[PDB]
Design a protein around this ligand. Sequence first.
Ligand SMILES: CC(C)CCC[C@@H](C)[C@H]1CC[C@H]2[C@@H]3CC=C4C[C@@H](OC(=O)CCC(=O)O)CC[C@]4(C)[C@H]3CC[C@]12C
Ligand SMILES: CC(C)CCC[C@@H](C)[C@H]1CC[C@H]2[C@@H]3CC=C4C[C@@H](OC(=O)CCC(=O)O)CC[C@]4(C)[C@H]3CC[C@]12C
Ligand SMILES: Clc1ccc(Cn2c(CN3CCCC3)nc3ccccc32)cc1
Ligand SMILES: Clc1ccc(Cn2c(CN3CCCC3)nc3ccccc32)cc1
Ligand SMILES: [Ca+2]
Ligand SMILES: [Ca+2]
Ligand SMILES: [Zn+2]
Ligand SMILES: [Zn+2]
Lengths: 669, 51, 669
Amino acid sequence: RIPLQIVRAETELSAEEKAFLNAVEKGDYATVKQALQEAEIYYNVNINCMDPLGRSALLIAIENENLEIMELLLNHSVYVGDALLYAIRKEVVGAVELLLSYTQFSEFTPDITPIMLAAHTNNYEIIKLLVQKRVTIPRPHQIRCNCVECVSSSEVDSLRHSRSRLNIYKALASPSLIALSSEDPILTAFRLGWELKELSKVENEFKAEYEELSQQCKLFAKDLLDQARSSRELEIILNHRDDLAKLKVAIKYHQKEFVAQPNCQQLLATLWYDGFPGWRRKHWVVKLLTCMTIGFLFPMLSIAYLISPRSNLGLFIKKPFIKFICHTASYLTFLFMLLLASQDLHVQGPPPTVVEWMILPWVLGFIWGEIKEMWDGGFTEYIHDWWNLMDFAMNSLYLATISLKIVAYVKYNGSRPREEWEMWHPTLIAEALFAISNILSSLRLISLFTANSHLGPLQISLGRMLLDILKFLFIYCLVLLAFANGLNQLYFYYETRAIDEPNNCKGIRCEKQNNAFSTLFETLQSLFWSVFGLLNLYVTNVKARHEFTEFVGATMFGTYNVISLVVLLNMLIAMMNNSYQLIADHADIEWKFARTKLWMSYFDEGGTLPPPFNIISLIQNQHYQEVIRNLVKRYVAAMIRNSKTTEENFKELKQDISSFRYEVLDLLG
Amino acid sequence: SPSLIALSSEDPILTAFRLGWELKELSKVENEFKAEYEELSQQCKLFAKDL
Amino acid sequence: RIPLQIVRAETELSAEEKAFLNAVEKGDYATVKQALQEAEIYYNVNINCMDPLGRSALLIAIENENLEIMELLLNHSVYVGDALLYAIRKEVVGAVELLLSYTQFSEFTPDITPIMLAAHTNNYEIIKLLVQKRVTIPRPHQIRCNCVECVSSSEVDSLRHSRSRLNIYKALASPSLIALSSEDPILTAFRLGWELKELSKVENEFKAEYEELSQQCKLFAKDLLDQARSSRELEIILNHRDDLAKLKVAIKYHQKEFVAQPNCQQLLATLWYDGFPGWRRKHWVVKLLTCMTIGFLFPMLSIAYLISPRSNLGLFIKKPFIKFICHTASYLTFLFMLLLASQDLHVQGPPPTVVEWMILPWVLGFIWGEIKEMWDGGFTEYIHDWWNLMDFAMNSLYLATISLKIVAYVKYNGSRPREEWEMWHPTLIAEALFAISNILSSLRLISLFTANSHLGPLQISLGRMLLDILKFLFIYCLVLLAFANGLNQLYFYYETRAIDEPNNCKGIRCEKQNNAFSTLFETLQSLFWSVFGLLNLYVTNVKARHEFTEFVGATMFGTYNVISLVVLLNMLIAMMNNSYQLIADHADIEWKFARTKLWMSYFDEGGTLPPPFNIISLIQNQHYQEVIRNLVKRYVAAMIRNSKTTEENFKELKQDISSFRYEVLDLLG
Ligand SMILES: CC(C)CCC[C@@H](C)[C@H]1CC[C@H]2[C@@H]3CC=C4C[C@@H](OC(=O)CCC(=O)O)CC[C@]4(C)[C@H]3CC[C@]12C
Ligand SMILES: CC(C)CCC[C@@H](C)[C@H]1CC[C@H]2[C@@H]3CC=C4C[C@@H](OC(=O)CCC(=O)O)CC[C@]4(C)[C@H]3CC[C@]12C
Ligand SMILES: Clc1ccc(Cn2c(CN3CCCC3)nc3ccccc32)cc1
Ligand SMILES: Clc1ccc(Cn2c(CN3CCCC3)nc3ccccc32)cc1
Ligand SMILES: [Ca+2]
Ligand SMILES: [Ca+2]
Ligand SMILES: [Zn+2]
Ligand SMILES: [Zn+2]
């Protein structure tokens, strides 16, 4: 048998104390009043005694929402320590008002204060009541602060310091506490969410709590925007300066839900189709014909803007959608010329052809536009855009091409057949670089999928899955390098000269593959091409009769095949499935944020002409404050309605019924 | 029972650890009633974590 | 503007009728009583008037659970038609008892009767109250009944007939109505669930409702079994005759949940490990060593059973687990001999070797065991097992092999080299058939995965996904046949003789593939092998300079590749994913049912010896009734507890409070 006793004993209550606590629980006002009056005289009952659950009489009265018994206990001067915190957590306005007018165990940490707890409960009534007085919340220090106080607190007690910081940020990120006590609730929500996201990044632990607090701030900003009821209010909000300034700030803080607001998107769409008033209601054929017409007329629009910007055609290109169409048409003509550029080849360093002469101004315009964007935007913004990396690569390659061409033009005059050219001849390197540049230039069209409704979210999904692909590539490369090292170690003894080969061809790119694993570089290439099955099996064979060596090499090759294809590739498929399912929910918001950024990029005056043509306050504050006041009122009302539309409710109902029953029985009897 | 471990136990954490281990072993041994022993062991682990 | 009026007008109530209905809704007994007494004298208020929702005063009283006002209305002789149905649906015992003691719109169809509705509500109290009287439910006819009444009702009104049949089966399948008014609740649940499943199969519409009713009956049987509290009760239940007879009946009706009951599984496990009392608590190495020892000693156990069944070794094989081990060991030795059978080949029809002479008794034993199982079990049971099909194939092939060998032995005596043998020589056909038989014999080991905990549910999952594979194979074959027809139509003009080929080899199985699409059979084979990439591209090339024909053939081949691989194969993967996710939940129950069938197959006396050694009542009814009574009581109590542990509840609370308030105000004032 297992004897069961009380290992951690406490102080039991007497019979009279238990009876008094039972009377308090049942809500019998008369018996509780008699017990208090008798305790004043006989001192037989301790009014501050706890229960087996640790609650005192005052805590029992608070938990039952019994205001009469609460006031009766308060009038008899019972212990009140931390009772206000319990009243606030219970979210009972009457208890809070009663207690405001006036080391034991506690359910609240020592750093919790009444205003902080009210903010944690996000109860607008109690938060407003506490802010009516002079209450303050301590300022959290910098995320990476290194002052003496922060390091001293962290070293003395890391748990307490982290808990206090989390409690402070829970208090500040309260939507009700931001609705009050905040000059600009929208900007406060933006920056508070950004700081919470940064804290989530920095704090490896407590990451989920900071992430959810940041998400809560983002949702509060979105709902405040949702409360707008007219286009005038929306324009006032988005144009406020601390045009579309606040929208730009929201984009800066990655407020995807705020930007993808349907009314914000509608306003941005009206700005986007400046020229066409009825683009929303048109047939597919009409839109396609209009887009084709504007694309084919892009040089005329660019020339008209160059000559006279103030005309029906001069300023027609400054419209965002028209500007986007013209830039896309210019890039498409550039790609068409790139395709045509491959339609005498023995000249060493030939002069550029007509197609190359037409291509050159586009390349110069691309370089000039890149450096102009670099100057106008800045450094950090330029480097934050990943597409710019590709642009840089393209430009560099093109520049290299030009350089090499010039070199080949000045260093060579004779016409020698390409068969006997040097391997590192300038023309061959220039042509290879130009081909790579063509590949990258055509691949640059992916970024335009954002402008499309059907292609945008798909591109978002693929870009997000590229992260899982990158994660898997590391372990794949580790396995590939391991097996390459092993196969090269095994096979490098049987390396044969190219002369001994049947066609004087050495390597795996010959008709009969040979020396697949002779060198580490060739072993890497062989193991790569085996993924796609282009490496034949007889490459694991050697001229000598070393059948054990051939079998071991074949076994290494087979194990590599099994791992890379059966195991790693299926695991990659499973990871992609999971990630795509995870990101399918938020694809629309991500796409709309990306498309909003694309649209905003075409609102600026700079960069109007596509290549190659580019180389040739108090009242506003008062209006914003009035609109913000209206939005805050509407948001508070809506959230109260949503909250209004548990076991403690049934406990309160029972308490009310019992109190009424005792009152009636006392009045009658 | 988490409440019965909170009382009547010198070391609730060690008791929870060893009780969860024994429940997992019983789940392995008992082909039937496997789910109930698994959930009891998980409950003991959660009690230790909450403590 | 859209004018809004009442298109379907009704008869509005007067002011006094509306006031009376409001008084009834509020529960004011005094005003309702006064209104009734005044209506008796002045005839100014219609006591049977409806409301805008169609409810009368009696229906309002029933819906509020106001028994006092209900009785007051009944004492004044108000219209009571279909009020009992509303009382039953509300599941109020007091209303039902009041109404039992005593063409307008109705919420219940005309075929609904009080007992049927009570069964639909599955309320044990009301069902028992109605069964206390003499109530009956009409018998549904046969599922495929063809009597005059059924066809007449179906032709006159199919909707009404189907609705009435569904209502009757909803009534009968009520767990409370089966707990009462049923001699054998378990057998009734089994057969009722089976019949509901058959109706679901037959009725293309209403399939989901019959499926859920059948599932409900299965769950009721499982819960009744769950209520057993001792092994004596469980043995009494499972051994009842209308051993393990009721368990066999449950297996017959595909009661997977009933069979996979943990207590049923525990009893079956104790029966399964008859010899070993402590097999449950043993190490993996001990179990593996014991299994290996018993497997290696299987011939000794078989011989001991043959000589003297009554000994420590004679009856040691009759134990189910030992019998399974011996049969598995015998089959494994047979497969080992099959492997050894491939370790002079110019003899036409050679005499059988030592390995073949050892194989022959195993084949004879397999055939004898198959026919013995066919005789002992029956025809329908034998043909219902799909594995038997494979067995049949194996046996047939083996028989064919023997026949051909005999033919080749008697028809040929000379030793001619195999190079110049006929294509259809008996020896070649016999060897091909024997190889196919070996493949099938080794593949027969899949059925033993059921005996394993880790391999059982996996086999269940793969077998269930084979259905999706079969479904996809139809459309794949349609596409394959279409493209084969097209490619053959295009290419059959350029068919070349085998002599013209470089190595006198024609077809795709040559070193240089040729005539890939010349004939329909060869086109089918080429398109099949292209799925795995073994068909080279140059097969779409012809000797003539018909570049358009070659391009069109290559385009057909490429379209076939795109469809079969990119489209069809990925769709097959998606289907397999969905089906595997769907069937992962019930894998354990399916596996335990299959393993129970496997274990039961080894409980019988017949078939004890594996090949080749196989060729050398009132008191029981009273006990079952007592156990069933105990189980029914426990089940009723448990289900009532589970149900006890809506807006109408709050409406009833408000009604009670208002009635109390009116009573107090009348008593005081
Ligand atoms: C598929 C093969 C033939 C490559 C074709 C290359 C280009 C001809 C395609 C690739 C991506 C296409 C672009 C994808 C995105 C759009 C957005 C599209 O706009 C919309 O879909 C909605 C209306 C709007 O832009 O406001 C305008 C056409 C455009 C630039 C497309 C123009 C044609 C592009 C450049
Ligand atoms: C993987 C390659 C080498 C093929 C091996 C063929 C056989 C040697 C394997 C295949 C399936 C195996 C069987 C799969 C299922 C079982 C159930 C297993 O029993 C259990 O797993 C639980 C204990 C119990 O049976 O009650 C006994 C061994 C046995 C017959 C296995 C014996 C060994 C088998 C016949
Ligand atoms: Cl070699 C290259 C270099 C840079 C770039 C980047 N870049 C683009 C590309 N856009 C045009 C349609 C899809 C994205 N337009 C530009 C206009 C001005 C400056 C840079 C520009 C593309 C290609
Ligand atoms: Cl050529 C063949 C023909 C039939 C069969 C079917 N069969 C089996 C197969 N069992 C043994 C282990 C896995 C399933 N044992 C038997 C014992 C008696 C009769 C038939 C029997 C297998 C192979
Ligand atoms: Ca750029
Ligand atoms: Ca069989
Ligand atoms: Zn600091
Ligand atoms: Zn009938």
